[PDB]
């Protein structure tokens, strides 16, 4: 995939290594196969290998893991692709023990993703089927490459697990992920971090490297630095409405495994949603995805004129000579026209939303809170949305933004919001409110103390009259609000974190630094532990492309999210 190689690090090395592993595994299971999938794995696996690769390894059928008998299929091998979860072991056992005995048998195998578990194997032994598996292996897919500068674990539960449940499973997988990267791209010599989760990931990296005892790593380092960052250091950013093109596609329709499902009316031919892939391999998308949505219209007009003129030029090609040439250019002209028609239709969909009265009002309120205005009174627009029973998650994002900008809400205010949320949406959501409190998102203020203004003014987090068309600062992605996370990264690089000591001390967790010894523009790998938004990603691309002698960023995360999916993941199954 060429686009995995457009930037600084060639992420095809990684993608191709994990593809090679899968191939080698399928080749041991000789003959025709069916794969039975733990449904949770199929989406993200899609970035590594589609059915087309599997087919060339005689995978003839693909099923979903469920109870009772397996479906009939005349194949030699059945292979379970499955997470190490206890409950799934019982289902596999039932599948295996329910095989029709008579006639040729089907050999069984199992691939645990992302790790094999002694405990799961014990369970399969007790259920009486461990000995029916010819191969039992693990496939340690941790960091999946989504684009040339972007890696995700796609672990949506990491934020909850770490900050509410004390479960750091996801931090172990992040560390393992970093070990795999270092085996391919060399040791990372400098490690910086801010946050509790970060401190643990660093500690595990260093331990895992001391306990390695294979060939010493000879690879010349591609990453100069790692920066580990806890999501809870910047709780504000994900709550705010994203204002970039890619951001708004995610806010409105949601991007899953780099695909979006759109309403089909505006698309060819026009029944089901139009499905499109969104990444840097499409020139036009590369050019507009990181822009503030108000700069996109002009870009589209320019392309329309260029494309339009190229096609208008077919009437002029009267000769045999210049018909040769026009013709040779046509495939590219057709693909550029198609790409433009799609994004032109997507921009019209986004415009229908961004010009609505409700959007204008939401944003006025968001911007009020981020610039420090009235962040302690019950807010009248929030109350209108609750009374009209708008989407619960929209309401929660807004009250959490208010809490974070005020360092909690006074008891009376918090309690007033909560009572009207429970009356309107149901008592059952008291669990959601408690979870938001434990996360630090919707909580009581303590003392009269409020630190956001010191943090905002000192890190220049809100600015008025920002340039959206030719940006000069990371605030362009939220039309005024500079994401705190990116601001911290920026200030680590220049002039350094010594200059903001007093502010770091009021943010959660320790700040720390470590070196890793080496045998005898910088590239920074920045790892968001607990999620990242596409707007933060754009802001980092913005710093990366200043040719001001700074740093270029490659982004990793536990999860690609937005405020809506972040908060859904903090709810419980109603």
């Amino acid at each position: 995939a060429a686009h995995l190689s457009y930037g600084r690090v060639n992420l095809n090395v990684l993608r191709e290594a994990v593809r090679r592993e899968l191939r080698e595994f399928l080749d041991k299971c000789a003959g025709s196969k069916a794969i039975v999938w733990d449904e949770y794995l199929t989406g993200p696996f899609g970035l590594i290998a589609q059915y087309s690769l599997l087919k060339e390894h005689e995978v003839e059928k693909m099923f979903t893991l469920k109870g009772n008998r397996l479906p009939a299929a005349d194949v030699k091998n059945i292979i379970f692709f499955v997470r190490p979860r206890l409950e799934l072991m019982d289902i596999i056992a039932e599948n295996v023990l329910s095989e029709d005995r008579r006639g040729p048998t089907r050999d069984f195998h199992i691939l645990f993703v992302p790790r094999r578990s002694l405990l799961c194997e014990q369970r399969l032994k007790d259920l009486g089927v461990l000995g029916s598996f010819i191969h039992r292996e693990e496939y340690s897919l941790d960091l999946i490459p989504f684009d040339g500068d972007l890696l995700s674990m796609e672990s949506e539960g990491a934020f909850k697990e770490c900050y509410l449940e004390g479960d750091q499973t996801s931090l172990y997988h992040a560390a393992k992920g970093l070990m795999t990267l270092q085996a391919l791209y060399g040791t990372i010599p400098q490690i910086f971090g801010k946050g509790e989760c970060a401190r643990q990931v660093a500690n595990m990296m260093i331990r895992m490297k001391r306990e390695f005892t294979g060939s010493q790593n000879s690879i010349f380092p591609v990453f100069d630095n790692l920066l580990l960052l806890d999501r809870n250091v910047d709780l504000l950013t994900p709550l705010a409405t994203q204002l970039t093109y890619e951001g708004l596609i995610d806010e409105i329709y949601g991007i899953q495994n780099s695909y979006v499902k759109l309403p089909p009316e505006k698309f060819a031919p026009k029944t089901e949603a139009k499905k499109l892939q969104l990444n840097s391999a499409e020139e036009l998308y590369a050019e507009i995805r990181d822009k503030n949505f108000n700069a996109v219209g002009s870009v589209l007009s320019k392309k329309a004129k260029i494309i339009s003129a190229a096609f208008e030029e077919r009437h002029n090609a009267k000769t045999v000579g210049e018909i040769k040439q026009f013709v040779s250019q046509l495939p590219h002209m057709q693909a550029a026209r198609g790409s433009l028609a799609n994004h032109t239709s997507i921009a019209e969909l986004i415009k229908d939303v961004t010009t609505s009265e409700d959007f204008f009002d939401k944003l006025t309120v968001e911007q009020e809170f981020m610039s420090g205005i009235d962040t302690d009174k019950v807010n009248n627009y929030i109350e209108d949305c609750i009374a009209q029973k708008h989407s619960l998650i929209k309401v929660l994002r807004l009250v959490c933004l208010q809490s974070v900008c005020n360092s909690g809400l006074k008891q009376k205010v918090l309690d007033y919001y909560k009572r009207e949320i429970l009356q309107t949406y149901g008592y059952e959501h008291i669990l959601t409110l408690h979870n938001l409190e434990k996360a630090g998102l919707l909580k009581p203020q303590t003392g009269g103390r409020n630190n956001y203004p010191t943090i905002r003014k000192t890190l220049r987090l809100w600015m008025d009259d920002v340039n959206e068309q030719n940006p000069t600062d990371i605030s362009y992605v939220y039309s005024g609000y500079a994401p705190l996370s990116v601001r911290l990264a920026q200030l680590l690089s220049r002039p350094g974190w010594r200059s903001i000591e007093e502010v770091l001390r009021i943010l959660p967790g320790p700040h720390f630094e470590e070196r890793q010894p080496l045998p005898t523009n910088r590239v920074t790998l920045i790892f968001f532990l607990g999620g990242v938004t596409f707007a933060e990603i754009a802001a980092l691309r913005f710093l990366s492309q200043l040719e001001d002698g700074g740093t270029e960023y490659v982004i990793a995360t536990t999860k690609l999210m937005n405020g809506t999916s972040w908060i859904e993941a903090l709810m419980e199954k109603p």
Binding site: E383, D384, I386, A387, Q388, K389, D415, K418, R419, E420, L422, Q423, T424, Y425, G426, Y427, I430, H434
Partner: protein, 95 residues
């Protein structure tokens, strides 16, 4: 008899939130108990289903079924302020 079990669980939960000094939670759990009890009367007195609806959804359903006196009374009992009730009525009745 059908809601005694659900009411007992909620009681156990109120008691828990009191031991925990979580006053808001205890009271809210008390209000939900009161509302489930009312919801069962309404099934008893009018038929149809009302259990498990939110308070807002209960009022809304009552308005829609023509039981406007019961709905108003229900709103007063839980001190729903004027502005929120007005919006509720308006969204209940609109195309």
């Amino acid at each position: 008899e059908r809601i005694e079990g659900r009411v007992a669980a909620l009681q156990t939960a109120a008691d828990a939130f009191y031991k925990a000094k979580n006053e808001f939670a205890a009271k809210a759990t008390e209000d939900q108990m009161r509302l489930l009890r009312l919801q069962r009367r309404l099934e008893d007195e009018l038929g149809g289903q009302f259990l498990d609806l939110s308070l807002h959804d209960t009022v809304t359903t009552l308005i829609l079924g023509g039981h406007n006196k019961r709905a108003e009374q229900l709103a007063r009992d839980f001190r729903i302020p004027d502005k929120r009730l007005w919006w509720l009525k308006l969204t209940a009745l609109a195309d």
